[PDB]
Amino acid sequence: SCFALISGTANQVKCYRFRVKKNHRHRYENCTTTWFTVADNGAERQGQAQILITFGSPSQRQDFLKHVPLPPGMNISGFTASLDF
Amino acid sequence: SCFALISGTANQVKCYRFRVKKNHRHRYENCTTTWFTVADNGAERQGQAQILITFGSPSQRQDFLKHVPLPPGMNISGFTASLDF
DNA sequence: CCGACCGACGTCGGTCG
DNA sequence: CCGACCGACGTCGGTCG
Ligand SMILES: [Yb+3]
Ligand SMILES: [Yb+3]
Ligand SMILES: [Yb+3]
Ligand SMILES: [Yb+3]
């Protein structure tokens, strides 16, 4: 349901997960490993590294946005998703 | 906007991406590397391996569901997501 | 079409300054 | 708080039967 996508360099996003899990565990539901959108040849990737963070509620997401610092050069987008099937 | 989450074993989902990219490229927008939800200790993961597949439109997603076979023991869920910020 | 398997390599958790 | 860096290892693209 309520989630955010955080993007940066792969190393950046990995180390960010480490500290979020360590210091701000109560501010989010779950978090993912680091992923990329794949491109067309071999192991090519497109775009920046990403993690997905889910929230229990939108209030929780707001708590997160207010309290967890975002390193320079990282970006965050927030979505709400309905199950289709 | 319109997406699906496909889950299975990590090897299962990787090999599935290989064939989807190879045979059914026109049936989807983009696809991700394989990811997991992390757990609480060391490199522990929770749940099955996942890939995210995006679609250009819901009609495209329907084309995909009708034409691309899903191996036994894999699962697919479909969502629609609105940008919050 | 499927996925165990190959060797390769980049992401892994963690450290530290 | 931040992220280059460490050595480790599991996911990587690809093969094949
Ligand atoms: Yb390319
Ligand atoms: Yb655990
Ligand atoms: Yb191996
Ligand atoms: Yb290295």
How does this model look, in words?
The structure is a homodimer of 85-residue chains. Chain A has helices spanning 10-23, 58-67, and strands at residues 2-8, 35-38, 45-55, 75-83. Chain A has a four-stranded antiparallel sheet. Chain A has 85 residues and is α+β, with helices and mostly antiparallel strands. In chain A, a hairpin with a 6-residue loop joins strand 2 (35-38) and strand 3. Chain A is globular. At the A-B interface, strand 2, strand 3 and strand 4 of A face strand 2, strand 3 and strand 4 of B. Residues 39-41, 44 of chain B line the site of one ytterbium (III) ion. Chain A binds a DNA duplex (17 and 17 nucleotides) through residues 9-12, 14-19, 23, 33-34, 42-43, 49, 69, 71-72. The PDB classes it as transcription/dna. Keywords: protein-DNA complex, double helix, transcription-DNA complex. It forms a tetrameric assembly. The entry is titled "crystal structure at 1.7 angstroms of the bovine papillomavirus-1 E2 DNA-binding domain bound to its DNA target".
Descriptors:
DNA-binding; 2 helices; homodimer; 36% strand; Alpha-Beta Plaits; binds ytterbium (III) ion; Regulatory protein E2 (chains A, B); alpha+beta
Layout of helices and strands, plus pairs?
The structure is a homodimer.
Chain A: E1 2-8, H1 10-23, E2 35-38, E3 45-55, H2 58-67, E4 75-83
Antiparallel strand pairs in A: 1-3, 1-4, 2-3
The structure holds ytterbium (III) ion (YB) (4 copies).
The site of one ytterbium (III) ion has 4 residues of chain A, from loops.
The first copy, chain A, binds a DNA duplex (17 and 17 nucleotides) through helix 1.
